[PDB]
Design a protein around this ligand. Structure first.
Ligand SMILES: [Zn+2]
Length: 29
């Protein structure tokens, strides 16, 4: 349904897992 990348500085809301599974790159390496 909805997914909120409320990381230790982020806060991005998304309406599918694919948007989060691609946003995760902004928190990779
Ligand atoms: Zn995030």
């Amino acid at each position: 349904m909805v997914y909120v990348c409320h990381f230790e500085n982020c806060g991005r809301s998304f309406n599918d897992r694919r948007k989060l599974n691609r946003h995760k790159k902004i928190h990779t390496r």
